[PDB]
XYZ file of C-alpha atoms in Angstrom:
416
model
C 0.000 0.000 0.000
C 0.922 3.562 -0.885
C 1.816 6.671 1.076
C 1.692 9.935 -0.897
C 3.244 13.179 0.406
C 1.980 16.450 -1.078
C 4.153 19.499 -0.364
C 1.881 22.530 -0.679
C -1.070 20.934 1.138
C -2.539 24.354 1.949
C -3.338 24.949 -1.748
C -6.672 25.875 -3.376
C -6.396 22.943 -5.811
C -5.997 20.341 -3.052
C -9.654 19.167 -3.341
C -9.076 18.482 -7.062
C -6.233 16.145 -6.073
C -8.126 14.194 -3.414
C -11.093 14.057 -5.813
C -8.704 12.512 -8.346
C -7.520 9.892 -5.846
C -11.141 9.135 -4.949
C -11.985 8.647 -8.637
C -9.070 6.182 -9.031
C -8.987 4.395 -5.651
C -9.811 0.923 -7.123
C -6.667 1.329 -9.303
C -4.681 3.226 -6.632
C -4.604 1.738 -3.127
C -3.527 4.982 -1.395
C -3.409 4.144 2.311
C -2.361 7.571 3.550
C -2.153 10.999 1.971
C 0.099 13.398 3.891
C -0.649 17.065 3.276
C 2.345 19.166 4.304
C 2.874 22.942 4.435
C 4.764 25.603 6.476
C 3.818 27.638 9.557
C 2.835 30.674 7.430
C 0.034 28.673 5.712
C -1.344 26.302 8.364
C -4.747 28.031 8.434
C -5.093 27.269 4.721
C -3.914 23.690 5.407
C -6.375 23.019 8.228
C -9.252 24.529 6.194
C -8.583 22.422 3.040
C -7.323 19.472 5.094
C -10.763 19.232 6.752
C -12.797 19.387 3.512
C -10.474 16.610 2.259
C -11.588 14.495 5.258
C -15.287 15.155 4.584
C -14.850 14.277 0.870
C -13.173 10.901 1.372
C -15.385 9.653 4.207
C -18.485 11.068 2.371
C -17.354 9.130 -0.746
C -16.619 6.090 1.490
C -12.997 5.745 0.333
C -10.396 4.810 2.999
C -7.496 7.240 2.433
C -6.198 8.535 5.759
C -5.587 12.258 5.386
C -2.564 13.348 7.563
C -1.823 17.049 8.107
C 1.648 18.267 9.194
C 4.234 21.101 9.066
C 7.025 18.497 9.476
C 7.646 17.140 5.981
C 10.196 14.557 7.193
C 7.237 12.714 8.771
C 5.241 12.862 5.507
C 8.275 11.788 3.436
C 9.113 8.890 5.779
C 8.592 5.833 3.583
C 6.619 7.676 0.881
C 6.058 5.995 -2.502
C 5.142 9.237 -4.299
C 5.914 12.883 -3.485
C 3.995 15.686 -5.210
C 5.024 19.363 -5.164
C 2.427 22.089 -5.500
C 3.889 24.923 -3.362
C 4.499 28.667 -3.875
C 7.594 30.236 -2.317
C 6.910 33.795 -1.133
C 3.162 33.298 -1.664
C 0.884 35.230 -4.033
C 2.443 38.452 -2.745
C 5.802 37.272 -4.229
C 4.007 36.450 -7.476
C 2.476 39.978 -7.522
C 6.006 41.456 -7.466
C 6.976 39.216 -10.389
C 4.065 40.533 -12.410
C 4.372 44.224 -11.379
C 8.121 45.018 -11.361
C 8.947 44.331 -15.053
C 5.880 46.253 -16.266
C 7.669 49.453 -15.214
C 10.398 48.657 -17.745
C 8.000 47.800 -20.589
C 8.775 44.102 -20.159
C 6.426 41.117 -19.741
C 5.552 40.403 -16.085
C 4.269 36.808 -15.788
C 4.822 33.889 -13.339
C 6.676 31.426 -15.668
C 7.815 33.640 -18.553
C 10.396 36.452 -18.575
C 11.956 38.004 -15.447
C 9.161 36.628 -13.226
C 9.784 33.070 -14.423
C 13.451 33.593 -13.651
C 12.659 34.696 -10.114
C 10.029 31.991 -9.588
C 12.724 29.426 -10.479
C 15.276 31.069 -8.171
C 12.726 30.943 -5.314
C 11.505 27.394 -6.002
C 14.444 25.187 -6.873
C 16.407 25.694 -3.606
C 13.390 24.240 -1.806
C 13.123 21.425 -4.374
C 16.836 20.649 -3.830
C 16.037 20.480 -0.104
C 13.100 18.118 -0.574
C 15.404 15.897 -2.638
C 17.997 15.901 0.182
C 15.286 14.551 2.505
C 14.042 12.025 -0.097
C 17.573 10.573 -0.606
C 17.201 9.134 2.902
C 13.559 8.965 4.049
C 12.407 7.528 0.699
C 15.150 6.872 -1.901
C 12.775 4.639 -3.885
C 10.072 7.303 -4.275
C 8.928 9.225 -7.340
C 9.007 13.033 -7.362
C 5.927 14.354 -9.194
C 6.398 18.130 -9.644
C 3.569 20.642 -10.407
C 5.544 23.573 -9.014
C 6.550 26.103 -11.657
C 8.747 26.879 -13.944
C 8.199 23.124 -14.127
C 10.530 22.752 -17.118
C 13.332 24.693 -15.390
C 12.598 22.854 -12.158
C 12.906 19.484 -13.988
C 16.148 20.656 -15.651
C 17.831 21.484 -12.316
C 16.844 18.114 -10.806
C 18.338 16.337 -13.813
C 21.553 18.360 -13.890
C 22.316 19.097 -10.193
C 20.764 16.106 -8.442
C 20.915 12.260 -8.496
C 17.112 11.944 -8.443
C 16.503 10.053 -11.696
C 12.841 9.346 -10.683
C 11.445 12.773 -11.666
C 8.446 13.863 -13.718
C 7.050 17.359 -14.349
C 3.332 17.870 -15.028
C 1.781 20.568 -17.205
C -1.934 21.341 -17.723
C -1.547 22.918 -21.198
C -1.666 19.686 -23.277
C -5.042 18.583 -21.796
C -6.468 22.092 -22.363
C -5.351 21.883 -26.014
C -6.828 18.394 -26.495
C -10.165 19.640 -25.081
C -9.919 22.780 -27.252
C -9.304 21.029 -30.579
C -12.043 18.497 -29.770
C -14.618 21.237 -29.031
C -13.583 22.870 -32.293
C -14.043 19.586 -34.149
C -17.300 18.993 -32.241
C -16.172 15.591 -31.045
C -15.478 13.780 -27.754
C -11.828 14.285 -26.683
C -11.069 10.541 -26.619
C -11.250 10.578 -30.450
C -8.467 13.232 -30.596
C -4.766 12.429 -30.258
C -1.980 15.026 -30.517
C 1.753 14.517 -30.857
C 2.982 17.156 -28.396
C 6.580 18.338 -28.491
C 8.657 21.213 -27.111
C 9.244 22.376 -23.527
C 6.986 23.136 -20.547
C 4.672 26.088 -21.443
C 6.497 25.932 -24.791
C 4.750 23.015 -26.415
C 3.526 22.517 -30.006
C 0.922 20.217 -31.484
C 2.990 18.797 -34.348
C 0.190 16.488 -35.567
C -3.467 16.118 -34.682
C -5.400 12.889 -35.336
C -9.131 12.201 -35.387
C -9.904 8.519 -34.972
C -6.160 7.977 -35.614
C -6.260 9.723 -39.016
C -4.300 12.993 -39.324
C -6.429 16.153 -39.416
C -3.764 18.802 -38.593
C -4.251 21.087 -41.642
C -8.009 20.756 -41.157
C -7.754 21.768 -37.470
C -5.404 24.646 -38.304
C -8.016 25.962 -40.779
C -10.628 25.753 -38.020
C -8.430 27.404 -35.356
C -7.947 30.532 -37.454
C -11.498 31.157 -38.858
C -14.406 30.412 -36.392
C -6.216 32.578 -29.940
C -6.437 35.425 -32.498
C -3.556 34.045 -34.590
C -2.876 35.490 -38.026
C -4.367 32.755 -40.265
C -1.487 32.849 -42.780
C 1.083 32.662 -40.013
C -0.705 29.676 -38.502
C -1.122 28.055 -41.936
C 2.507 28.899 -42.726
C 3.609 27.315 -39.412
C 1.705 24.017 -40.075
C 1.676 23.110 -36.356
C -0.463 24.165 -33.406
C 1.005 26.625 -30.864
C 0.069 26.594 -27.172
C -1.261 29.687 -25.332
C 2.180 30.531 -23.924
C 3.493 31.068 -27.477
C 1.629 34.381 -27.448
C 4.369 35.809 -25.189
C 6.858 35.170 -28.016
C 4.733 35.508 -31.213
C 2.220 38.071 -29.863
C 4.378 39.949 -27.341
C 2.769 43.377 -27.710
C -0.714 41.894 -27.098
C 0.305 40.142 -23.852
C 2.096 43.249 -22.501
C -0.971 45.369 -23.176
C -3.173 42.821 -21.314
C -0.843 42.849 -18.294
C -0.613 46.650 -18.118
C -4.370 46.853 -18.388
C -4.949 44.207 -15.709
C -2.399 45.850 -13.378
C -4.299 49.132 -13.652
C -7.866 47.785 -13.311
C -8.796 44.282 -11.976
C -5.267 43.711 -10.655
C -2.484 41.446 -11.840
C -3.240 37.723 -12.097
C -1.898 37.068 -8.564
C -4.061 39.855 -7.102
C -7.137 38.468 -8.894
C -6.124 34.927 -7.813
C -5.847 36.272 -4.213
C -9.447 37.565 -4.183
C -10.598 34.243 -5.610
C -8.541 32.218 -3.131
C -9.930 34.195 -0.141
C -13.558 33.657 -1.243
C -12.998 29.889 -1.562
C -11.373 28.944 1.735
C -14.569 30.591 3.034
C -16.386 28.039 0.820
C -14.322 25.225 2.367
C -15.657 26.211 5.834
C -18.680 23.792 5.747
C -19.795 21.141 3.332
C -13.597 24.207 -12.080
C -11.553 26.287 -14.552
C -8.070 27.494 -13.525
C -6.078 24.244 -13.701
C -6.602 20.492 -14.403
C -3.175 19.851 -12.776
C -4.028 17.213 -10.171
C -6.132 15.349 -12.762
C -2.945 14.802 -14.841
C -0.948 14.022 -11.701
C -3.381 11.294 -10.705
C -3.371 9.854 -14.270
C 0.424 9.723 -14.242
C 0.687 8.169 -10.747
C -1.936 5.546 -11.566
C -0.265 4.727 -14.900
C 3.138 4.355 -13.247
C 1.750 2.222 -10.393
C -0.254 -0.007 -12.784
C 2.359 -0.169 -15.586
C -0.452 0.866 -18.012
C 1.853 1.973 -20.878
C -0.754 4.481 -22.073
C 0.555 7.724 -23.704
C 0.793 10.936 -21.648
C 2.614 14.241 -22.307
C 4.995 14.936 -19.415
C 8.304 16.554 -18.572
C 11.221 14.080 -18.575
C 14.790 13.536 -19.628
C 15.016 13.967 -23.434
C 17.389 11.069 -24.135
C 17.338 12.170 -27.795
C 13.578 12.315 -28.414
C 14.190 15.829 -29.825
C 17.487 16.011 -31.724
C 18.110 19.735 -31.102
C 17.860 19.306 -27.338
C 20.572 17.731 -25.186
C 19.927 14.155 -24.069
C 20.449 15.345 -20.475
C 17.861 18.120 -20.715
C 14.152 18.100 -19.871
C 11.569 18.133 -22.636
C 7.770 18.003 -22.683
C 6.728 15.208 -25.052
C 4.279 12.308 -25.373
C 5.607 9.382 -23.327
C 4.703 5.782 -22.675
C 4.004 5.617 -18.939
C 5.526 2.454 -17.453
C 6.243 1.437 -13.857
C 9.902 2.191 -14.604
C 8.747 5.722 -15.571
C 7.869 7.753 -18.676
C 9.366 6.514 -21.972
C 9.494 9.354 -24.514
C 8.416 8.668 -28.094
C 10.966 9.727 -30.740
C 10.020 13.032 -32.325
C 13.113 13.433 -34.539
C 13.256 17.218 -34.207
C 11.069 20.293 -34.101
C 10.256 21.940 -37.425
C 12.893 24.584 -38.374
C 10.285 27.323 -37.960
C 9.937 26.723 -34.193
C 13.300 25.060 -33.404
C 15.055 28.399 -32.778
C 12.472 29.573 -30.248
C 12.616 26.353 -28.214
C 16.466 26.489 -28.240
C 16.338 30.021 -26.826
C 14.013 29.005 -24.005
C 16.193 25.981 -23.265
C 19.307 28.166 -23.195
C 17.342 30.412 -20.775
C 16.166 27.455 -18.616
C 19.695 26.051 -18.344
C 21.464 29.304 -17.406
C 18.548 30.228 -15.055
C 18.671 26.813 -13.342
C 22.434 27.137 -12.904
C 22.034 30.593 -11.278
C 19.315 29.100 -9.012
C 21.729 26.520 -7.608
C 24.909 28.638 -7.440
C 23.456 32.050 -6.624
C 26.090 33.494 -8.987
C 25.059 37.047 -9.901
C 26.820 37.207 -13.268
C 25.115 33.912 -14.181
C 21.715 35.301 -13.143
C 22.384 38.447 -15.239
C 23.207 36.374 -18.299
C 19.916 34.401 -17.913
C 17.930 37.635 -17.699
C 19.786 39.247 -20.607
C 19.390 36.304 -23.038
C 15.660 35.894 -22.328
C 13.738 36.807 -25.564
C 11.432 39.188 -23.624
C 14.195 41.368 -22.118
C 15.303 44.214 -24.471
C 18.804 44.821 -23.196
C 21.585 44.114 -20.685
C 21.002 47.561 -19.171
C 17.323 46.792 -18.454
C 18.211 43.203 -17.466
C 20.486 44.463 -14.652
C 17.926 47.047 -13.464
C 15.159 44.437 -13.187
C 17.593 41.862 -11.706
C 18.809 44.215 -8.977
C 15.272 45.420 -8.121
C 13.880 41.859 -8.012
C 16.856 40.507 -6.048
C 16.098 43.139 -3.403
C 12.310 42.610 -3.631
C 12.592 38.860 -2.948
C 15.541 38.985 -0.430
C 13.662 36.813 2.113
C 13.127 33.991 -0.417
C 16.590 33.869 -2.005
C 18.859 31.987 0.391
C 21.403 31.197 -2.348
C 21.752 35.019 -2.991
C 21.091 36.421 0.513
C 22.137 34.116 3.335
C 20.497 36.340 5.959
C 18.259 36.679 8.997
C 16.242 33.474 9.506
């Protein structure tokens, strides 16, 4: 029987996870689910932890929900470890989204400066969790939701001996559901060869009942978002929503500026929503299907299903332009020995440059996250496609370094 530790127990999406485990309990004999968090979020943990208890006993499914702020207890003998935490909270995210806007640069949680700083905040903690796992549970799988999930995965591959790693993304499922709605068909009739990186993923080929309908779908997509039809038809593959930061950069910067000055940035909007939702969890959607994909992956691993899922894993040559050591997001066969990537060959020339830039970014950013080397951080910032110059790169870097002092132990060793 299985013990599953979830770091970031105090999260809004926690019910989605337990719901997932409830759905799959016949397949997944989860004996105990340990929900762990830190002192500064134990109200959120006890609120969602309690709903989780109602849900499982109401559904008559015998997972023991354990709540703790001591993750060594949760990790002790775990079979799977999931990460769904936010370092610095939504207030740290708000700084990521606001600071770069001043400079006329994209401010977003996983793209641009803010994705750099999210990585810098997150991976030190992931490196810590791995230190604990290489002892309390050296056999366990690390299943990472926590963002920049591609950069996170990269660091674990390069700076760690944890070969049992997978990164989840929710974009591929959104795209499958999108193309299906467009085609006016149930999603189980749609398959997509996904390839690229996390939040940097293309639909190279779309199939309907196993027969290729890519061109057909591309005609639909531009004609019923907001792609130039001839660009999309010229491209011959399906971009994900995150490609708008790179191919529609002016549009995304305008949205951000607008949001910042009206509704609030995404983190400020997410904050309002999160507050009026813990209040819902007090006594007896859209946003993310993350834990759905996590549950599918865990179940497939545990059961050796060998069904196909898009996940983040070690390339091992599935994409020729990407190092064998690096993380890619591709369709994989999910075995009990882990995800087995399906050969892609390489990305089309058209998009191969963009993915190589992001990879370059991911690799230099992940290095800076582990070393805390300032010059290295400045290079990461400067080479990012969304940063105009070295001058601006330094300005943002120095302001954000200072803004996130408390959450940057590799850069600031200080006070607690």
